[PDB]
């Protein structure tokens, strides 16, 4: 996270760290959507142009963390993965369309003060909240500049008008993505960056005071560059797939 600040303790209790077993390293962010399902970006798990294709046994998730590096015996839970599900129409070859994956844990995680699931938006919440100029929040342990934080970082960023998102890049954007960040004329900064990938873009609903995950950190060109914006997987538009997976493979 570029131009953010340290999270408060328990501020993002759905934040998940995707961790490589060998060598031991942070791979990505992710989010807790129930006691046994975790949401992330497909490109965190599968990206053939970089020879990336993880299997379940290659990875762990770490839930309830604050420190990037310390083992938080008190508060974090480390879980194994039962199965990875990648959207079948994830378009890694072109534009990262449908950049979304689910991971089922080998056993349910107990919720605590530090571990708690985020909501997924319904259609009307998405329609109402995902509008240009409204702000959401991104969290992660990724780079501080295009340089790693000690603890989880947070930044709030405005959703950007689709034509502005489109004109900012030559990548072929789709309706399964949105972009967020300040415009040069707004005189403020901030972005997600490498290592934040797969983590959540959330909004606090004014209708029911609950936090909803609207996006997944997906792609960008550099980090925090003027006239560039971070791109996020549009969670509501991919919710039909999430529901199909969970219905078939078991809540």
């Amino acid at each position: 996270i570029v131009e953010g600040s340290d999270a408060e303790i328990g501020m993002s209790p759905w934040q998940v760290m995707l961790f490589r077993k060998s060598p031991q390293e942070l791979l990505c962010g992710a989010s807790l959507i129930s006691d046994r399902w975790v949401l992330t970006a497909a490109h965190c798990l599968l990206y053939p142009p970089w020879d990336k294709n993880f299997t379940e046994n290659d990875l762990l998730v770490r839930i309830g963390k604050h420190s990037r590096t310390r083992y938080e015996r008190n508060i974090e839970k480390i879980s194994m993965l039962e199965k990875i599900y990648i959207h079948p129409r994830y378009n890694w070859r072109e534009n990262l369309d449908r950049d979304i994956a689910l991971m089922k844990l080998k056993k349910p995680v107990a919720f605590s003060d530090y571990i708690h699931p985020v909501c997924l938006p319904d259609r009307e919440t998405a329609a109402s909240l995902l509008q240009a100029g409204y702000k959401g929040r991104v969290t992660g342990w990724g780079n501080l500049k295009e340089g790693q934080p000690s603890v989880l970082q947070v930044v709030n960023l405005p959703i950007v008008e689709r034509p502005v998102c489109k004109d900012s890049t030559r990548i072929r954007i789709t309706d399964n993505m949105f972009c967020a960040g300040y415009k040069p004329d707004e005189g403020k900064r901030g972005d997600a960056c490498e290592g934040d990938s797969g983590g959540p873009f959330v909004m606090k609903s004014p209708f029911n005071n609950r936090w909803y995950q609207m996006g997944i950190v997906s792609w960008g060109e550099g980090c925090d560059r003027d006239g560039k914006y971070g791109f996020y997987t549009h969670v509501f538009r991919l919710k039909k797939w999430i529901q199909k997976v969970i219905d078939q493979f078991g809540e």
């Binding site: 699931p117 947070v154 609950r210």
Partner: peptide, 30 residues
């Protein structure tokens, strides 16, 4: 179900340091 309500914030009637920026964007952002 209980999703999206944080034990250390909403459940204790406590606000985090920047959530009001999100709420205010609903007033001023459009």
């Amino acid at each position: 179900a209980d999703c999206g309500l944080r034990p250390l914030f909403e459940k204790k009637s406590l606000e985090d340091k920047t959530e009001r920026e999100l709420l205010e964007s609903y007033i001023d952002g459009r």
